[PDB]
């Protein structure tokens, strides 16, 4: 997918490789290699191509696709600044251990529901 | 304490050792050893002395005094037949992991409060 995006980006602007190669550091043989998915660019190369495109590195990775330290829902509650505020890392550890052989609370609010109840009890 | 209880039991009935020794299997030198706390009786010996006294082994240990597999409160909820019923051993495992560096819910009902809330969520 990443390489397919780098061709998609070039191609929808109807640019030939040699046009991108001018404005950017990159060689035509090199850009061809990256667009083929032979070798993987650095974040450096991606700035350069974002640069060529003129898009942001963030907006470059828009389509592309390619184990969690907290449960998905608990992660999201902590990420959210409006809802997270006062939850402490001690509480995060406390809340990660809540599991019934597999099943967990689903969403941020599911998690916040519990946090508040338990907060009172402990 | 156990030995002190075995003397307390004998003594408050104003029995001399030799009186207990008659009715029971036990020798006077042996009962003396047990009342001194030199050597510890089996549950067998204790029946015999309960027997002599006439009390129950349970009622013998009434005064006496001498690490938990579940938290104290969670233990008590499970022990209680009226309140426990439908809580499963999977849930017991789930509930034992609730702790905030040290602090836990106190009583049976504290524990039941949580169980019911979480039961809904999971």
- Indicate yes or no: CB of B122 within 8 angstroms of CB of A104: yes
Interface test with B, best of A90, A91, A98, A112 (most B CBs within 10 A): A98
**Dist CA A32 CA B9 (whole Å):** 98
Instruction: Classify burial at A5, counting beta carbons within 10 Å of its beta carbon; exposed 0-12, middle 13-18, buried 19 or more.
Output: middle
Hey, is the C-beta of B62 within 8 angstroms of any chain A C-beta?
no
Radius of gyration of chain B (CA): 22
Taking alpha carbons only, the member of A42, A50, A52, A59 closest to residue A21 is A52
Domain boundaries, given as residue ranges, for chain B: 1-122
- Indicate yes or no: CB of B94 within 8 angstroms of CB of A90: no
- Indicate yes or no: CB of B94 within 8 angstroms of CB of A104: no
Sign of CA dihedral B3, B9, B15, B21: negative
Tell me the nearest-neighbour CA distance from A89 into chain B, angstroms.
11
Instruction: Collect all residues of chain B within an 8 Å Cβ-Cβ radius of residue A108.
Output: none
**Dist CA A119 CA A71 (whole Å):** 19
Hey, is the C-beta of A89 within 8 angstroms of any chain B C-beta?
no
Residue A96: both structure tokens together: 């990660």
- In chain A, residues preceding a discontinuity (C to N beyond 2.5 A) are 66
Of A90, A99, A117, the CB nearest to B94: A99
Hey, is the C-beta of A94 within 8 angstroms of any chain B C-beta?
yes
Cβ atoms A100, B87 nearer than 8 A: no
Of A99, A104, A122, the CB nearest to B105: A122
Cβ atoms B76, B108 nearer than 8 A: yes
Instruction: Collect all residues of chain A within an 8 Å Cβ-Cβ radius of residue B101.
Output: 90, 94
Residue B88: both structure tokens together: 């499963």
Cβ atoms B54, B15 nearer than 8 A: no
* A72-79 and A108-121 helices, crossing angle to 10°: 80
Kindly report the backbone phi and psi dihedral angles of residue A85, in degrees, each rounded to the nearest multiple of 5, phi listed first: -25, -80
Q: How far is CA B73 from CA A99, B68, B100, B107, in A?
A: 20, 11, 15, 5
């Amino acid at each position: 997918k990443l390489h397919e995006r780098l061709r998609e980006l070039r191609s929808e602007r109807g640019l030939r490789l040699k046009d991108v190669a001018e404005v950017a550091q990159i060689s035509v043989p090199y850009l061809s290699d990256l667009e083929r998915g032979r070798t993987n660019p650095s974040l450096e190369t991606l700035q350069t191509l974002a640069g060529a495109y003129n898009i942001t590195v963030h907006d470059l990775l828009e389509g592309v696709e390619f184990e969690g330290a907290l449960p998905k829902g608990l992660s999201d509650l902590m990420a959210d600044p409006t809802l997270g505020p006062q939850i402490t890392p001690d509480w995060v550890r406390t809340l990660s251990r809540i599991e019934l052989r597999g099943k967990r609370p689903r969403d941020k609010q599911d998690w916040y529901e519990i946090y508040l109840h338990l907060k009172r009890i402990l």
